Amino acid sequence: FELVDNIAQTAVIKVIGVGGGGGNAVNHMAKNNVEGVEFICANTDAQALKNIAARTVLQLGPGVTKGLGAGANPEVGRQAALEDRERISEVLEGADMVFITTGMGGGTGTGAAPIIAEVAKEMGILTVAVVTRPFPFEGRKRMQIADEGIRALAESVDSLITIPNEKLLTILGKDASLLAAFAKADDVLAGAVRGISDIIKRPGMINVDFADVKTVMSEMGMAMMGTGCASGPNRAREATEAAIRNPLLEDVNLQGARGILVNITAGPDLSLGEYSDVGNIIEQFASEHATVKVGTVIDADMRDELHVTVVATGL
Ligand SMILES: Nc1nc2c(ncn2[C@@H]2O[C@H](COP(=O)(O)OP(=O)(O)O)[C@@H](O)[C@H]2O)c(=O)[nH]1
Numbered sequence: 001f002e003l004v005d006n007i008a009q010t011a012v013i014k015v016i017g018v019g020g021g022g023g024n025a026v027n028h029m030a031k032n033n034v035e036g037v038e039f040i041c042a043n044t045d046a047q048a049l050k051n052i053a054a055r056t057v058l059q060l061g062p063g064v065t066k067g068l069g070a071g072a073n074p075e076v077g078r079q080a081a082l083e084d085r086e087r088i089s090e091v092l093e094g095a096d097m098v099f100i101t102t103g104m105g106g107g108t109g110t111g112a113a114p115i116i117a118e119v120a121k122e123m124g125i126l127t128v129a130v131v132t133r134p135f136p137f138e139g140r141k142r143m144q145i146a147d148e149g150i151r152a153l154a155e156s157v158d159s160l161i162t163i164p165n166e167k168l169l170t171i172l173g174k175d176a177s178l179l180a181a182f183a184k185a186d187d188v189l190a191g192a193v194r195g196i197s198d199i200i201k202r203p204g205m206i207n208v209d210f211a212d213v214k215t216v217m218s219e220m221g222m223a224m225m226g227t228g229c230a231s232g233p234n235r236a237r238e239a240t241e242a243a244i245r246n247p248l249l250e251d252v253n254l255q256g257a258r259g260i261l262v263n264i265t266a267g268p269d270l271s272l273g274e275y276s277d278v279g280n281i282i283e284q285f286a287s288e289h290a291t292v293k294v295g296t297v298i299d300a301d302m303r304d305e306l307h308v309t310v311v312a313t314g315l
Contacts, residue, residue, distance in 0.1 A: 005211030007096055013197050014092065015099040016040040016058075018116065019077070019109025020048060021132070021185070022102035027053040028186040033301070034194045036201030037099070040091060042116070044080045044108045045069030058091055060084050060112060070107030074145055077111030088119045096210060097126040097200075099193050100157070103185070104146035105134040114149060117156045126214055129157045130192040132185055135165040154221055159313055161192055161223045167247040188248070192225055195309040199263050204296025206275055208261075212293045216259035220314035224252050228308045235266075235306040236274035240281045243308045254285045258314030265297040266306035278308055 015037045017026030023041040030039045030053030039054035046067025049057045059067060061080020070076030081088070092098060098120045102109035113129065121127045131150065134143045154160045168184045169176050196217075199208050217223075226246025230238030244254070254260065264270060264278050279294045286292050 005209045008209040008211075009201060009203060011096040011200050011210045012094055013037045013097045013099070013201065014040060014095045015101065015193055015197075016042055016091075016116065017054075018042050018100065018102040018113045019106050020045065020103070021106065021182070022109050023048055023052065024182070025101055025103070025186045025189040029190045029193060030054050032190060034190060034197070037193070037197050042088075042091075042112070043069060044077060044112070056091065058084070058087060060108065070111065072107040074107055074111030074149060077106075077108040078115060079111075080108070081112040081115035085115075085119065088116055089123065092120050092123055092125060095120070095123075095125045097128065099197075100127065100129040101131065101189055101193060103132045104149050104153075105138060105142035106145075110145050110149040114152045114156055117153060121156050121158070126218060127157045128159050128161070128196070128217060129153055130161045130163070130189055132163045132165050132189065135169065135181060157221065158218045159220050159223050161225060161311070163188055163192070163248065167250065170247040170250075191227055191309065195225065195227075195263050195311065196261070198265065198297040199261075199295040202297050202299070204264065204266070204270055204298040206272065206294075206296045208293050208295030212295070213261065216261045216291055216293045216313055220259050222315045223311055223313045224249055224315060225309065225311040229305060231303075231305040235304065236277040236308075237281065239306050239308040240278050243310050244285060249310070249312070252312055252315065254312055255287045256315055257286070257290055257312035259312075260286050260290055260292045261311040261313065262292070262294040263297055263309040263311075264295070264306065265299050265302070265309070267303055268298065268300065270296060270298075270306065274306065282310070
């Protein structure tokens with residue numbers, strides 16, 4: 001309750017997007033409602049890094065690729081990354097937590113991300129990776145590489161949030177279309193990152209800190225998440241139902257999650273009343289052993305709506 005942690009709200013959070021898709025997702029975040037974090041784009045494609053939101057960029061494998069980017073080849077991404085080990089670390093120093101975000105299935109992102117996680121993880125930084133999985137319409141070829149990297153990535157991250165791009169279609173449905181599909185991806189990834197950092201950076205009346213997060217998140221590996229967003233007299237219960245009922249949490253057995261982290265983002269009116277509801281609903285779907293951390297986020301530039309965001313760790 002009363003006693004807060006060592007480096008609570010103060011935690012220096014960096015967010016790095018690897019490869020193309022990643023850069024896109026990141027640059028989206030910048031030009032959006034994602035504050036308290038330092039953005040960074042890291043691509044082997046020197047070209048891509050030209051003129052982008054994030055004020056910190058890192059070109060990988062200058063030698064290996066010559067600013068031409070690992071032609072969808074993971075190995076080239078991994079090689080370019082190892083070449084830049086030093087540079088990677090220089091960019092990471094001072095971070096309490098790092099967000100490696102990227103679209104798996106490509107070359108830069110796929111092969112480079114695991115290395116970067118490896119670095120940070122060594123520096124003793126809370127390493128969380130938020131990555132997508134090719135849309136069905138991307139070919140088994142690409143979908144094959146994704147699993148591949150994800151397997152490797154998992155080996156060196158405190159936690160790994162997978163996002164089955166398929167599900168995004170589920171949602172979209174009618175308006176499903178390349179533009180929207182990837183735009184949606186961008187958005188969801190932003191949610192995942194914003195989802196957690198906001199809990200640390202923009203606390204509400206009841207708050208969770210870095211110590212709380214470190215717990216449910218440190219070396220848990222393999223996570224999934226889902227969002228809900230209601231409003232009106234029962235925005236609480238509703239927004240929560242919607243969260244669990246989120247497709248992105250369709251085939252997930254919360255009873256299994258060793259750790260569950262929750263985020264309630266609402267106006268200055270978010271009463272303790274609701275908070276209780278949010279947690280009660282959760283406490284049922286969770287395994288009595290599971291360690292559940294529920295926190296509040298405060299947002300003014302938002303009204304009656306109350307968005308809940310759950311994250312199942314140590315799956
Ligand atoms: N969210 C999001 N995902 C993307 C975008 N572009 C591509 N992707 C996905 O992420 C993967 C990475 O592809 P790409 O960025 O070309 O790989 P890179 O070689 O690491 O640059 C793809 O296979 C897609 O499924 C984008 O703009 N946004």
